[PDB]
Design a protein around this nucleic acid. Structure first.
Ligand code: MG
Ligand code: ZN
Lengths: 1318, 99, 50, 83
DNA sequence: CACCACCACGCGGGCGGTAGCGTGCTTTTTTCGATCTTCC
DNA sequence: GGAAGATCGAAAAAAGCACGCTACCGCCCGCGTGGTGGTG
RNA sequence: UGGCGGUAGCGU
């Protein structure tokens, strides 16, 4: 039907063409007559007949009003940046002081002194009239601005501004002029004209879109649009009558200003002045109010809408249901499937007309149930919970008709839905086309979804009663009935258990046959006698043939059941796994019912050792309080000791209680006693993992531990009472603080989580897999992440399901281990981990060479299926949902001098230069030296960062044992390390002018301290302190390898104790320089928004030496001088920012100059795309892992790639892009490729990092940006620039109403594109 | 609550909301995202057009199910037409170009 | 929305709506009453000489 | 009578054109009055279409050539009727 | 049959007043007067 | 060697603030003037 | 034969 959508500002001729009439009277509807007036807002002669299949002309026929005087459009005037002001190169204040009749503006300068665009007030106006008069033109109002816009010519202004920009040098003026040039070019390459920005004809919406509904009481609705139109019509008619009466200037000026205000209010109420108040004492709804916002059309009727064939009801557990089945009420199914029932009834001929079909339906005849059963036999229904956090929030199920009003849900899918049976409601939708039923059965079916797309972990696990039943069944006593007998098989064990002859926990010996899979793929049987229990033998009957017997020969806790299901899925397949899961659930439920486990007041046994420990803790706290009264310990340390001893007492109580609980059962075997694992119901629930953890059971039976008051501090006295015992008023009041804090946190987290999820979806909605292989050899290097004492993520987890970017060489043999373009599945990961491979280069989405999407190979595994990702996958939406789903699990409320070695291995050093001191210990004279604990396999087991002037216990390449200290330093002050041994002398920091002399506190030594540059006078700040190391011959000795002599320049506040002329050794200390984030969801939001930290870290843009200069006003100036290149680089650093680098050191690109958080933009600019991607993924993974959430790095990489989509030009080259233009990176790449193919030279570009909201707003498709947020500004920019939008996206096609080019519609879109090309 | 076909709004031509008045469940933005995460393309088009906005599509789908044909005509949602008219009511021209 | 220590005997620390308006809506205690100036007060028993 | 379509997915190969070919076949039997290539155990058209792909009796290539076969046949029949 | 009471009504808009009203969020962009700097 | 350029800190303005659902009420000109009908 | 606003509640 159509290919793209064009948006532009409307000329008056086009507006007149749209209208089918002229509105002249402000009469909507007569109350008595019930007939609209002629030339009114509801006139039938303008918008078509009121009545006649339906009168659609009244919905599409528009009107127009001929304005007596021109009025400025509020959108093109008040939406910053102002289009009119930018076009006219005039400040906005003059613009809307001229528009609203407060100052005059000149149009034709003539021969007079005044220029073209000047602002004249009343006194200036008649002064000019009296002084000159003659022919100069000074107009007032919106017509003045319209004439000014019409008079100007775009071509010569643009060319002269471009030629000025070529010869300009001011950066702010450069940005201003490049913005103006872009605006002028966009205006000139389109059919739009500046004079069209001033409204002269006002369009009028069709009446059906602003209906006057009847109130069934003699009156009508509000219809704020009608009220605003009536006010505009009144103002226009009054102005027309005034003009026809030849009014004086004041009256027409006031009327024109009021008409302009009314037009502005109609277009955008409350934009400039006070909003017009209606009959409800609130601002009226203007035209712009029905487009933007959450309640606007885009987010309320286009992105989402109410749908027929849908229902809602509460949920109920169906234990008898299969994994693919759900219970549906009979009445709900009958209502939902009414057209299908009509069709079946007419096909089978029980009714003559469809009216008879409804007449058989609603009366509920007997055959209606049979018809309904027939029509729902294989018709899937989509069940969805209200918060659809991730993909699994809606799933397809086969309906089973049930009696009642509640939907019956399979328990195993509840974890996918995050649904519990305490009042939750679910919505059911009925697909009514063959395609939709096919995708419901093949894509949205519950059986298909077994693995979470976020991380690949299984989603169907037993949770509450299945785990308990399986745990009880698979357990052993020592003297149970029927112990020691030999059984022919599992059937005999089941018969014995049902007959009561043998207990479920009896330890017997049974003959079982297990089937193993050989190389050829079939099953070979092996029969053997195994010592097991009756319950395990019974449970063996539901295990499929391929699985071994070792899975069930254990206690079978929650983790054991999950592992058994995983092994069944890996070995057998999918359908046997589904059958096994259903059988496991059935058996667990049945045997949990048979067990009769119950919770009683005597189950939570309380040990008396807990009371003794509590009394001892009271005695210790009394001793501590007495010591504090003695005055030997301060408040802070005594409070810390009290907290520590209370924590120790709580730990002891918990340990004693757990020891009592786990092995309380001391039972008698045939001859004597034996201590076995206890059968306490609370202990069984805790151990099996069905419900509860160690902390909750400890709160139930042991002391509740320390509690924190709302400000974050810990109260000295903990809750020493169990929940079984009686908490006093104080303990309950204290616990209410934490309870309220948690409840408020989870109440206020949802809004921010939803906003972040929406932003992430909108920034990555249009990313789909469009190609199969880029062929690029560039990827990212993945290595295990280690932060001082722990390997959080092994390489196997990071590289699983990812294709390699280059041939991985075997370590130490220079032989290829894996091919260049192979997918790293489980076998490849095992091969990599068995060959001691540390770093692997793998292709990444952020480096995908495919434009307008990504390739399948550069993405990797689907993460929901074993095979590789398919072409067309909406990976961006999946990534956004996967990142946003665990947002509710985060938190928002804001609450070393040595290196310790724990493992055994060699030590390696990175980017290190050091020197041997007098004692022989190594002291590092570098700022970024890194140390790694390389094991015997070569893996980087541990990583540490050493500071400046840190001693080394032992050198590189030596093996050390755990528990040893290899590096020591003082974080209180930074030392100065010398590299040459010689006499130390003072130069240019005599006392009294630039430094000071301070007496020691107790030693009395007079130490010289370098005074601050601001603190010292001008006579001392001119020179700089100099410590000179000289040899015997007398002058300063140059550093080995450097011609520049070894003089150290002391920075501010430097303290030196040794006197001049004292011989020192290499590596000695010369001077000492004094040395001085919370929340998970906010941190993630800042990371994804690329927010600049409040204290950014200063980094070296270019590599070279460092030098100081003038102090300017109150903050230092810095100069970076490279050895070979020129020296134009100067920085502007405050005092309060610490200077990590000294005056006479050498720095590289991206070096840390000031300690603090690193801005992502600086990281991208100085280190590249890969470094910023690594930083972002590391930060996000750290935040998510702090809460124990597993998310694959593919989603974060996809988001990062979405952020990096724009580049700024530097050298224009043969391309037509402007020097300062910021344009999509894909366009730059395509232009450069075309220029290289044609033999010309390309344009140099620098990629920039934008926040998620900024990246989503600054996209090619204006429709997506408008629907996201800030609709007014996006629409104004699109209209001014005349943007043409091809859909080629998910949101655009959803809004339009066509197939998205992601799933089954990807082939359709490809065919359409091929047809268009051909 | 359950609804197959009832009354619709007089402006957006969408089904009403609530239980007191016969109305259908709202297929919000998050559900659309979930469908997009699947391969659900025909299902999404069915949700957006043939069941909510496209009056001609709704009638054709009802007739096709009555006669036994499970085929759809997506048509043109009325909500987009309303939005286009609302935008055109300002000084901004927007149209669906064919070429 | 937090539970201030001064809520003891004047505002129930647990009786509060679960949702957006948590902590903003409270319930008066059993023995709590109001001053002549509008400030909440709670009863106590005077302890003299132990 | 159908719960999992993993084998059908691997037969088609990508889980996407499987839906398209199954829908096309279901429309062919439902609207065009075609005879299923497998016995129907009281099943819907979609389930029958999914079930007759499992053993390879329906895929894109043979469906396309078969549709071309009857379209040539009907063109020839129309030509003979004209003559 | 010119005087009071009922309903159109008309333009009017911020209302009522012999003036103000406003008062517990966070982030990004503009901008605008004031200040220091440097060379033509 | 004093006014444009650059900086810059404060003030203002604009944009945003999860989804689905249930129940209830309150309101949907105006006002105060004048044309016109009833009337002592 | 609809909208706006306020209030309270439910599931997250
Ligand atoms: Mg619940
Ligand atoms: Zn690629």
């Amino acid at each position: 039907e159509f290919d793209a959508i064009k948006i532009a500002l409307a000329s008056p001729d086009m507006i007149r063409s749209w209208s089918f009439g002229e509105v002249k009277k402000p009469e909507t509807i007569n109350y008595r007559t019930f007939k609209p007036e002629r030339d009114g807002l509801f006139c039938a002669r303008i918008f078509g007949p009121v009545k006649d299949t339906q009168t659609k002309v009244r919905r599409e026929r528009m009107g127009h009003i001929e304005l007596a005087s021109p009025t400025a459009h509020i959108w093109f005037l008040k939406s910053l940046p102002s289009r009119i002001g930018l076009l006219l190169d005039m400040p906005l204040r003059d613009i809307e002081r001229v528009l609203y009749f407060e100052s005059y503006v000149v149009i034709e300068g003539g021969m007079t002194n005044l220029e073209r665009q000047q602002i004249l007030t009343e006194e200036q106006y008649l002064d000019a009239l009296e002084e000159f008069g003659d022919e100069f033109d000074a107009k007032m109002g919106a017509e003045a601005i319209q004439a000014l816009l019409k008079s100007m010519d775009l071509e010569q202004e643009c060319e002269q501004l471009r030629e000025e920009l070529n010869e300009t040098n001011s950066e702010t003026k450069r940005k201003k002029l490049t913005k103006r040039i872009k605006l002028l070019e966009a205006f000139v390459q389109s059919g739009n004209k500046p004079e069209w920005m001033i409204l002269t004809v006002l369009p009028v919406l069709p009446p059906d879109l602003r209906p006057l509904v009847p109130l069934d009481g003699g009156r009508f609705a509000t219809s704020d649009l009608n009220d605003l139109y009536r006010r505009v019509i009144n103002r226009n008619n009054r102005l027309k009558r005034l003009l026809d009466l030849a009014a004086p200037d004041i009256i027409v000026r006031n009327e024109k200003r009021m008409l302009q205000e009314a037009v502005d209010a109609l277009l955008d109420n409350g934009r400039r002045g006070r909003a017009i108040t209606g009959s409800n004492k609130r601002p009226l709804k203007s035209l712009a109010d029905m487009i933007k916002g959450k309640q606007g059309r885009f987010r309320q009727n286009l992105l989402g809408k109410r749908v027929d064939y849908s229902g809602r009801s509460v949920i109920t557990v169906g234990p008898y249901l299969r994994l693919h089945q759900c219970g549906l009420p009979k009445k709900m199914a009958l209502e939902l499937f009414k057209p299908f029932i009509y069709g079946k009834l007419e096909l089978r001929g029980l009714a003559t007309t469809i009216k008879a079909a409804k007449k058989m339906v609603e009366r509920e005849e007997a055959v209606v149930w049979d018809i309904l059963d027939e029509v729902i036999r294989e018709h899937p229904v989509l069940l969805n919970r209200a918060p659809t956090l991730h993909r699994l929030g809606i799933q397809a199920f086969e309906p089973v008709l049930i009696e009642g009003k509640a939907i019956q849900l399979h328990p195993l899918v509840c974890a996918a839905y995050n649904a519990d049976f305490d009042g939750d409601q679910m919505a059911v939708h009925v697909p009514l086309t063959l395609e939709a039923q096919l995708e419901a059965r093949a894509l949205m079916m519950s059986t298909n979804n077994i693995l979470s797309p976020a991380n690949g972990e299984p989603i169907i696990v037993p949770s509450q009663d299945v785990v308990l039943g399986l745990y009880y069944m698979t357990r052993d006593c020592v003297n149970a009935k029927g112990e020691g007998m030999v059984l022919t098989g599992p059937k005999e064990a089941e018969r014995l258990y049902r007959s009561g002859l043998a207990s479920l926990h009896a330890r017997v010996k049974v003959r079982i046959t297990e089937y193993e899979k050989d190389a050829n793929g079939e099953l070979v049987a092996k029969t053997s006698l195994k010592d097991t229990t009756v319950g395990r033998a019974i449970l063996w009957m539901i295990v499929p043939k391929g699985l071994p017997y070792s899975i069930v020969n254990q206690a079978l806790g929650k983790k054991a059941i999950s592992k058994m299901l995983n092994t069944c899925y890996r070995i057998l397949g999918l359908k046997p796994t589904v059958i096994f899961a259903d059988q496991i659930m059935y058996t667990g439920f049945a045997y949990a019912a048979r067990s009769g486990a119950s919770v009683g007041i005597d189950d939570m046994v309380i040990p008396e050792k807990k009371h003794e420990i509590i009394s001892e803790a009271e005695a210790e706290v009394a001793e501590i309080q007495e010591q504090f009264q003695s005055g030997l310990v301060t408040a802070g340390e005594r409070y810390n000791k009290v907290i520590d001893i209370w924590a120790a007492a709580n730990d002891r109580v918990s340990k004693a209680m757990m020891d009592n609980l786990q092995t309380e059962t001391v039972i008698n075997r045939d001859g004597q006693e034996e201590k076995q694992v206890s059968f306490n119901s609370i202990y069984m629930m805790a151990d099996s993992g069905a419900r509860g953890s160690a902390a909750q059971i400890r709160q139930l039976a042991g002391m509740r531990g320390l509690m924190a008051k709302p400000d974050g501090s810990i109260i000295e006295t903990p809750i020493t009472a169990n929940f079984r015992e009686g908490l006093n008023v104080l303990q309950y009041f204290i616990s209410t603080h934490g309870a309220r804090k948690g409840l408020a946190d989870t109440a206020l987290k949802t809004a921010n989580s939803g906003y972040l999820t929406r932003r992430l979806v909108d920034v990555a909605q249009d990313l789909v897999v469009t190609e199969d292989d880029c062929g690029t050899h560039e990827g990212i290097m993945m290595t295990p992440v280690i932060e001082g004492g722990d390997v959080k993520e092994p390489l196997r987890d990071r590289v699983l399901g990812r294709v390699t970017a280059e041939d991985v060489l075997k370590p130490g043999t220079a032989d290829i281990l894996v091919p260049r373009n192979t997918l790293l599945h489980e076998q490849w990961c095992d091969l990599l981990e068995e060959n001691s491979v540390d770093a692997v280069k793998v292709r990444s989405v952020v480096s995908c060479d495919t434009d307008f999407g990504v390739c399948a190979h550069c993405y990797g595994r689907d993460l929901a299926r074993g095979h590789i990702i398919n072409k067309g996958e909406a990976i961006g939406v999946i990534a956004a949902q996967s990142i946003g789903e665990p947002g509710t699990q985060l938190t928002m409320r804001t609450f070393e001098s040595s290196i310790q070695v724990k493992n055994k291995g060699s030590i390696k050093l990175s980017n290190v230069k050091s020197v041997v001191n007098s004692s022989g210990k190594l002291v590092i004279t570098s700022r970024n030296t890194e140390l790694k604990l390389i094991d015997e396999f070569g893996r980087t087991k541990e990583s540490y960062k050493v500071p400046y002037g840190a001693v080394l216990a032992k050198g590189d390449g030596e093996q050390v044992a755990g528990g040893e200290t290899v590096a020591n330093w003082d974080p209180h002050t930074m030392p100065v390390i010398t590299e040459v041994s010689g006499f130390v002398r003072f130069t240019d920091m005599i006392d009294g002018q630039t430094i000071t002399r301070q007496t020691d506190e107790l030693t009395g030594l007079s130490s010289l301290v370098v005074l601050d540059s601001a603190e010292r006078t001008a006579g001392g700040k001119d020179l700089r302190p100099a410590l000179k190391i000289v040899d015997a011959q007398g002058n300063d000795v140059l550093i080995p390898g450097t011609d520049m002599p070894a003089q150290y320049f002391l920075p501010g506040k430097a303290i030196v104790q040794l006197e001049d002329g004292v011989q020192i050794s290499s590596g000695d200390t010369l001077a000492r320089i004094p040395q001085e984030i919370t929340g998970g969801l906010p941190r993630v939001a800042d990371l994804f928004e690329a927010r600049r930290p409040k204290e950014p870290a200063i980094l070296a843009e270019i590599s070279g030496i460092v030098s100081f200069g003038k102090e300017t006003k109150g903050k230092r100036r810095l100069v970076i001088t490279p050895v070979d290149g020129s020296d134009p680089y100067e920085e502007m650093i405050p005092k309060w920012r610490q200077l990590n680098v000294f005056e006479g050191e050498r720095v590289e690109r991206g070096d840390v100059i000031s300690d603090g958080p690193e801005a992502p933009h600086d990281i991208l600019r100085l280190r590249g795309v890969h470094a910023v991607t690594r930083y972002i993924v590391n930060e996000v993974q750290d935040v998510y892992r702090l809460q124990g959430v597993k998310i694959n790095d593919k989603h974060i990489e996809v988001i990062v790639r979405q952020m990096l989509r724009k580049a700024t030009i530097v050298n224009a080259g043969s391309s037509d892009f402007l020097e300062g233009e910021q344009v999509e990176y894909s366009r730059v790449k395509i232009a450069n490729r075309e220029l290289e193919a044609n033999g010309k030279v390309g344009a140099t570009y620098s990629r920039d990092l934008l926040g998620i909201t900024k990246a989503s707003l600054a996209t090619e498709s204006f429709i997506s940006a408008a629907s996201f947020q800030e609709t007014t500004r996006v629409l104004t920019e699109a209209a001014v620039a005349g943007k043409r939008d091809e859909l080629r996206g998910l949101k655009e096609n959803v809004i339009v109403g066509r197939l998205i080019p992601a799933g089954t519609g990807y082939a359709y879109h490809q065919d359409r594109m091929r047809r268009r090309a051909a | 609550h359950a609804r197959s076909t009832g009354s619709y709004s007089l402006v957006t031509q969408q089904p009403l909301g609530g239980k007191a008045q016969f109305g259908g469940q709202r297929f919000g933005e998050m559900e659309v995202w979930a469908l997009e995460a699947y391969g659900a393309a025909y299902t999404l088009q069915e949700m957006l057009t043939v069941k909510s906005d496209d009056v001609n599509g709704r009638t054709k789908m009802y007739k096709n199910i009555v006669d036994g044909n499970h085929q759809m005509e997506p048509g043109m949602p009325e909500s987009f037409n309303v939005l286009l008219k609302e935008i055109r009511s300002l000084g901004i021209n927007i149209e669906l170009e064919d070429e | 929305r937090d539970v201030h220590p001064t809520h003891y005997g004047r505002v129930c620390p647990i009786e509060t709506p679960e949702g957006p308006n948590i902590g903003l809506i409270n319930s008066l205690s059993v023995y709590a009453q109001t001053n002549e100036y509008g400030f909440l007060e709670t009863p106590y028993r005077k302890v003299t000489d132990g | 009578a159908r719960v999992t379509v993993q084998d059908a997915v691997e037969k088609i190969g990508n889980r996407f054109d499987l839906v398209l070919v199954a829908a096309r076949r279901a429309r062919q039997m439902q609207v065009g009055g075609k005879d299923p290539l497998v016995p129907e155990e009281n099943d819907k058209t979609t389930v029958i279409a999914l079930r007759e792909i499992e053993e390879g009796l329906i895929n894109n290539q043979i469906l396309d050539v078969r549709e071309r076969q009857e379209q040539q046949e009907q063109e020839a029949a129309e030509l003979q009727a004209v003559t």
